[PDB]
């Protein structure tokens, strides 16, 4: 057994949607995709869920940031400061 | 309620009916035979996947 880099997986890109300190994400994979995040406060408040059924989800993003992992697609990151004027 | 139809020998005027419930909604999608009273988003806008 060797450390080959398999030609490997990739899940379709997400639909990013803005709200006030909140990411609505209409999402639509090919296969069951383990999504997960890390609210970068010292309060981690992570989430995990395999997604195979297309699902609009939500994420209470904080002031300092959140990150977002659409499958083995690379991890995203997001500034959600205010939007409530 | 002013249309006759002189087919046969009798002249007959019908309605207008009082029960104006169009079971169709304003916005409708249609597929082959199955009709869906769906709020289709619009031409020109529909989000991908949706």
Swiss-Prot record, chain B:
Bilayer disposition of the protein: Single-pass type I membrane protein
Top-rank lineage group of the source organism: Viruses
Subcellular location: Virion membrane; Host cell membrane
Post-translational modification: N-glycosylated.
Task performed by this protein: Class II viral fusion protein. Fusion activity is inactive as long as E1 is bound to E2 in mature virion. After virus attachment to target cell and endocytosis, acidification of the endosome would induce dissociation of E1/E2 heterodimer and concomitant trimerization of the E1 subunits. This E1 trimer is fusion active, and promotes release of viral nucleocapsid in cytoplasm after endosome and viral membrane fusion. Efficient fusion requires the presence of cholesterol and sphingolipid in the target membrane.
Subunit note: The precursor of protein E3/E2 and E1 form a heterodimer shortly after synthesis. Processing of the precursor of protein E3/E2 into E2 and E3 results in a heterodimer of the spike glycoproteins E2 and E1. Spike at virion surface are constituted of three E2-E1 heterodimers. After target cell attachment and endocytosis, E1 change conformation to form homotrimers. Interacts with 6K protein.
Record-given protein name: Spike glycoprotein E1
Natural source organism: Eastern equine encephalitis virus (strain Florida 91-469)
Organism classification: Viruses, Riboviria, Orthornavirae, Kitrinoviricota, Alsuviricetes
Boundaries of the shown chain within the full protein: 952 to 1001 of 1242
